[PDB]
């Protein structure tokens with residue numbers, strides 16, 4: 001399924017190249033411009049734990065990019081997305097909630113998967 005496909009075929013978009021955040025584009029965007037740090041960003045997402053034990057969906061989620069308001073993986077991943085793009089991210093715990101987790105919702109050393117649609121981004 002989608003998590004396995006990303007694991008096998010996804011681009012490694014971490015700077016350190018440690019496979020911590022893997023990406024596949026699913027639906028292409030419009031324009032060349034991807035959002036700068038500081039931009040208010042608007043998205044629809046689906047999300048789940050590898051554990052199979054929790055699912056979550058926006059189904060408009062709003063955050064300021066690259067400000068650590070979201071897990072590092074989103075700050076990295078969404079920064080590479082263009083308006084109208086849909087992407088799959090698979091994320092190792094180092095780029096999400098780490099060894100501590102975020103109990104009870106997120107366990108220790110969790111791997112996360114997300115499907116993200118980037119709707120738009122305005123400058124702050």
Ligand SMILES: CCn1cc(COC(=O)[C@@H]2CCCCN2C(=O)[C@H](c2cc(OC)c(OC)c(OC)c2)C2CCCCC2)cn1
Pocket residue numbers: 045047048049054055056063069070071074102105106112
């Ligand atoms: C106010 C900005 N914000 C940050 C968060 C923390 O979560 C996140 O940064 C990432 C990325 C952005 C979407 C939400 N998200 C998550 O991990 C989900 C998430 C959604 C949450 O609420 C919608 C949430 O509660 C605040 C939470 O707590 C750690 C984590 C998680 C995905 C795996 C399946 C369980 C939920 C929630 N809101």
